């Protein structure tokens, strides 16, 4: 076992960008404990000339997630899955019956 080199504890958002901007591979990331939102975790990631931050969300059950993807209609769900797999273990993309 080795400590996870991506957990940085409490460090300023600015210092995380400064640090990650020096990285050369898109995706270089770190998890930090937010200062502006006590109790929350933030994901900082390098991408191009920027550094993006994602707030780690939670639900009443204590789950951790970045997005809640749902739709208002079946047609909206259909379009989404034309480019995003409908399966978790396989890559299946919806395409019209011909």
């Amino acid at each position: 076992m080795k400590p996870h080199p991506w957990f940085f504890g409490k460090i300023p958002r600015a210092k995380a960008e400064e640090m990650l901007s020096k990285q050369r591979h898109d995706g270089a990331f770190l998890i930090r404990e937010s200062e502006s939102a006590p109790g929350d975790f933030s994901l900082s990631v390098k991408f191009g000339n920027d550094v993006q931050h994602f707030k780690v969300l939670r639900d009443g059950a204590g789950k951790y997630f970045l997005w809640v993807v749902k739709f208002n209609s079946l047609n909206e769900l259909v379009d989404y899955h034309r480019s995003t797999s409908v399966s978790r273990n396989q890559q299946i993309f919806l395409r019209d019956i011909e």
Binding site: S42, Q52, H53, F54, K55, L57, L66, W67
Partner: peptide, 4 residues
């Protein structure tokens, strides 16, 4: 945050 991108996701908020």
């Amino acid at each position: 945050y991108v996701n908020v």
